[PDB]
Write a protein that binds this DNA or RNA. Structure first.
Length: 122
RNA sequence: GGGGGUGAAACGGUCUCGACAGGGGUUCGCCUUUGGACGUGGGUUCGACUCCCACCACCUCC
């Protein structure tokens, strides 16, 4: 169930700020999440248009049996206010920073939320 | 091939804080409201992830 962070990142990049952003999941995705054999090995977030879609996040699809689910590595959108969103973007694509998946979990109100943060390292 | 069990740490009361769409409003700034994620389509409920309903999938029992 709940809280699973990205241990892959600490030794790779370094966080500047950290935002929290609800994600656009489907439902089975959510079940896969309530479990825990998904990985951020390689996953970061990117703005395809003006919206930010965390990508390469693999979420083992209802992998406690076998089921009739979805594309494990699907570009999942991210939610964040217009103001809270116009920022991070301007502090990034200069290719100096990177949107990397920090932690994942469900909030008080029961919603899976992702935690992102600026990055850089070598 | 039949039988049983499983499909959200609160055993009913949503607001995905946010993006994005669909409204109704607007001094075109913006305010307001609805959706969207809990395997799936179904109804039932003032309202449900949690109550029914099949159909699926896992596991399981002659």
């Amino acid at each position: 169930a709940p809280v699973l962070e990205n241990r892959r990142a600490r030794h790779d990049y370094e966080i500047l700020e950290t935002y929290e952003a609800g994600i656009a999941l489907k439902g089975t995705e959510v079940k896969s999440l309530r479990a825990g054999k998904v990985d951020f090995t390689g996953s970061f977030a990117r703005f395809e248009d003006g919206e930010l879609y965390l990508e390469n996040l693999y979420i083992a699809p209802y992998e406690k049996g076998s089921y009739a689910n979805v594309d494990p590595r699907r570009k999942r959108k991210l939610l964040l206010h217009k103001h809270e969103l116009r920022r991070l973007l301007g502090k990034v694509e200069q290719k100096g920073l990177t949107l990397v998946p920090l932690k994942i979990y469900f909030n008080e109100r029961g919603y899976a939320k992702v935690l992102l943060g600026l990055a850089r390292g070598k």
